[PDB]
Design a protein around this ligand. Structure first.
Ligand SMILES: O=C(CC(=O)C(=O)O)NCCCc1cccc(Oc2ccccc2)c1
Ligand SMILES: CC(C)=CCC/C(C)=C\CC/C(C)=C/COP(=O)(O)O
Ligand SMILES: [Mg+2]
Ligand SMILES: [Mg+2]
Length: 281
């Protein structure tokens, strides 16, 4: 086991620890793409966790900026050396959309002074910023020949997974003084998240919730129709990852839209979906 290997194995460990669904799916890729995904994931994870002062976050961004500007020089990285070595290795072989990392970093900067979204257009803007961008970064890894269409589909997939995420974590997000539903939309459906958190679900909350779920689902289906932008090996894997994540919606409904648990897709269910998909291919 080389050192580079150790860097990637650490990235993997972070991905397994933090996302069971994406780890489950993406570990099925060929070795080289697998590892590229571990590293991009681990970077994005560290950015997302970095605030836990802007101190660390500035260092990550400077690291990323060193790699962009000097891909083949040795850097003394300021943040997480193992993750940054791995990302540099990836960049040496693959076209990385660095500005997409900076979009993500800017978005995380901004959650410091967080204020609720006035309109769905802001919320969807947020979904681009934290997920759409990541879809774009992953594009060269998951497709042979990259076009505006490939980035488009990847970005839409990312944004739809983010919305499914938001839909899982309503209650936990509330505890952490975040609400992601737009004020426009809360007013229209006459929902008050505080009230629902205390008094349990109702038919307003459920309608609002399902408004957003219907959007995520439609975007999901539009991605699937276009799965072919991706390399032949990645298609079944990206369909797995998406399907496993959208299943999260059925889990929320079955738990009656609870705001006091994180629902989950059982591992045995992940494998069921793998079967269904792996058989179509
Ligand atoms: O917001 C959450 C998560 C969350 O709220 C929760 O769990 O509550 N995530 C958005 C933060 C940015 C980010 C971080 C890490 C990995 C990411 O994407 C990849 C990358 C590669 C493969 C799959 C997915 C994106
Ligand atoms: C295959 C393709 C283009 C995917 C598109 C980009 C993508 C998958 C995801 C962004 C969604 C996120 C951040 C979900 C929650 O984070 P965890 O990973 O659970 O910590
Ligand atoms: Mg997650
Ligand atoms: Mg969340």
């Amino acid at each position: 086991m080389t050192m580079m290997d150790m860097n990637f194995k650490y990235c993997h460990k972070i991905m397994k620890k933090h996302s069971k669904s994406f780890s489950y799916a993406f570990d099925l890729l060929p070795e080289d793409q697998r590892k590229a995904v571990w590293a991009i994931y681990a970077v994005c994870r560290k950015i997302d966790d970095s605030i836990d002062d802007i101190q660390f976050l500035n260092q990550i961004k400077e690291d990323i900026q060193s790699i962009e500007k000097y891909p083949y020089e040795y850097h003394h990285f300021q943040s997480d050396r193992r993750i940054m070595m791995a990302l540099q290795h990836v960049a040496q072989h693959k076209n990385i959309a660095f500005q997409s990392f900076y979009n993500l970093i800017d978005t995380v900067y901004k959650d410091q002074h967080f204020t609720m979204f006035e309109t769905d257009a802001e919320l969807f803007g947020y979904c681009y910023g934290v997920a759409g961008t990541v879809g774009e970064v992953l594009t060269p890894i998951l497709s042979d020949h990259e076009t505006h269409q490939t980035y488009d589909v990847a970005r839409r997939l990312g944004e739809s997974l983010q919305l499914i995420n938001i839909l899982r974590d309503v209650g936990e997000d509330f505890e952490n003084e975040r609400i992601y539903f737009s004020k426009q939309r809360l007013k229209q459906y006459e929902v008050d998240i505080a009230e629902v958190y205390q008094n349990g679900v109702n038919n307003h909350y459920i309608d609002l919730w399902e408004y957003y779920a219907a959007i995520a689902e439609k975007d999901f289906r539009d991605v699937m129709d276009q799965i072919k932008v991706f390399s032949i090996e990645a298609q079944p894997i990206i369909e797995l990852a998406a399907r496993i994540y959208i299943e999260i919606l059925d889990e929320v409904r079955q738990a009656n839209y609870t705001l006091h648990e994180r629902v989950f897709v059982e591992k045995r269910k992940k494998a069921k979906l793998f079967h269904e998909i792996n058989s179509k291919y």
